[PDB]
């Protein structure tokens, strides 16, 4: 049946090339021999035998079979290398996680400078992204790593999330120690910069907001190399963490340790005065220092900016495929 995973061989896919470097394996693009469907195969190596099957892959399998949404990347099946079939111990073969094939990644499109996003385009993009985040946040799973590389878009204008490698469930009533360093520094919230280990789902929201600004500027907002420099940049824009706005900042481990150059005032509305009013309000609330005051996904969808967007419209983003040639 369709459910008997891990047995079908990778022979069934014609390998087209290697689309990307992975965490636990290389990512290959392939075509299904039987259907012609283009798939994306991520390789899982248990030959390392340090810890056997990598947990990063275990999370991506465990979670993505449970989560089904139009903005969540679908794992179609798991296939294997040719079987020795005489002794299982000798087998050093590897497994492949079949995913749907997304045409482009958001970082790629911005870094190639080949995209121009109109207000209406950003609405369709952020609506799908935050609707997907809401599905996951309602299922009590946390992405813990949001980045432009991780949001994939088809040329059709559909958006999908594809980084469940660092995902874990969050229990509201029962808080437990979590890994402090979870997001790429550019999209890491102030709480995790100050080291809060019991983090809310709002860590992902901060990241999605960083993207909202990035789509309007085409340049990431907080570009730093070191954790202190990042807190400084965030502080120059959002304001310095202080009990006046973040009453529990004193409870966070590094508040006395990590001070910015000044106690800055928030300028987010001034430095982004070129953004539409509905969007700026979304950005201002998503980029709130206190995670308990930062808006949730459901609230972001019930915003003047994203509420009245028709998902059917799916205005494709603009790509200039022929003009680029010359």
């Amino acid at each position: 049946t369709e459910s008997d995973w891990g047995k079908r061989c990778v022979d069934k896919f014609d390998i087209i090339g290697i689309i990307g470097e992975g965490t636990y394996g290389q990512v290959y693009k392939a075509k299904d021999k039987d259907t012609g469907e283009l798939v994306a195969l991520k390789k899982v190596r248990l030959d390392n035998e340090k810890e056997g099957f990598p947990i990063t892959a275990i999370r991506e399998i465990k979670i993505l079979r449970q989560l089904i949404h139009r903005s969540v990347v679908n794992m179609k099946e798991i296939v294997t290398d040719k079987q020795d079939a005489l002794d299982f111990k000798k087998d050093k073969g590897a497994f492949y996680l079949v995913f749907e094939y997304m045409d482009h990644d958001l970082m790629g499109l911005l870094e190639s400078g080949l995209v121009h996003f109109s207000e209406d385009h950003i609405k369709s993009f952020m609506k799908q992204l935050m609707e997907g985040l809401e599905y996951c946040h309602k299922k009590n799973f946390l992405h813990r790593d949001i980045k432009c590389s991780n949001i994939l878009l088809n040329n059709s204008g559909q958006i999908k999330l594809a980084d469940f490698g660092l995902a874990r469930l969050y229990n509201s009533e029962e808080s437990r120690p979590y890994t402090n360093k979870v997001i790429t520094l550019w999209y890491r919230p102030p709480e995790l910069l100050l080291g809060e280990e019991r983090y809310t789902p709002a860590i992902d929201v901060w990241s999605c907001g960083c993207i909202l600004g990035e789509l309007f500027t085409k340049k990431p907002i907080f570009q730093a190399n070191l954790e202190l420099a990042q807190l400084e940049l965030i502080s120059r824009l959002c304001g310095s963490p202080c009990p006046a706005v973040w009453p529990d900042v004193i409870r966070l481990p590094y508040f006395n340790t990590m001070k910015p150059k000044k106690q800055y005032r928030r300028r987010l509305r001034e430095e982004f005065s070129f953004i539409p009013s509905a969007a700026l309000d979304l950005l201002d609330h998503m980029l709130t220092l206190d995670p308990s005051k930062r808006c949730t996904a459901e609230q972001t969808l019930q915003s003047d900016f994203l509420k009245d967007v028709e998902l059917s419209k799916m205005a494709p983003p603009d790509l200039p495929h022929w003009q680029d040639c010359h």
Binding site: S3, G6, K7, G52, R65, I78, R168
Partner: protein
Amino acid sequence: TKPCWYWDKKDLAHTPSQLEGLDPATEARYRREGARFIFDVGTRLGLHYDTLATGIIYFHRFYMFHSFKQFPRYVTGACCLFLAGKVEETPKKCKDIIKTARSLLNDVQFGQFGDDPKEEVMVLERILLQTIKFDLQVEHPYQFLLKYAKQLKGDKNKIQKLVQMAWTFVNDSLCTTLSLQWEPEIIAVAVMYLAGRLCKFEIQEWTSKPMYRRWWEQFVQDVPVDVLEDICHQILDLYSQGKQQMPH
């Protein structure tokens, strides 16, 4: 989409092991020992009750697809627990799991692990994952016992007694083949039903519908008493066979 992980009691006489010559009593004895091995080992380490159960549901499912005479049970058990730890985010190093096993196992028993215990276990992970059809997410009776108990109102002490006795029955159910016969929701209701009959409590009164004598039907639709009676019979059999008695 997703696989079917439940068989009928009658189908358990056609497990691979039974056909290779293991008698029904022995396969069940092997089933208890392997499950209790998984339980005791994980308890000796620091593991959440869900992690212990996940390993046991894995182990039980495994020997519905393979035979005990070719796969030594304590190696399998150790492998299930090792994977369960990664699945449930309570990870342990394989070497630490092996060490705990040596403390708890006879030298004869540790012989199953062969000359290189860690290798025999790590190598099995490949087979385990393919066997469980890469369906790693598992739900256990525990969450439903609490979800349903929370919706009951009455004497706190009487309600807690039902919860604790039932929680004890769930732990015992892991040793039985029931995890392979009935969904976890049904089990949570069955262990509640048993605690109710033994404590002479009438649960309907605590439910929101006090005149609804079939109290469970407001939690689990379409469950006949037939099923709840079979499950209870199977749980209490473990106590009557053993020298142990109902907790009360």
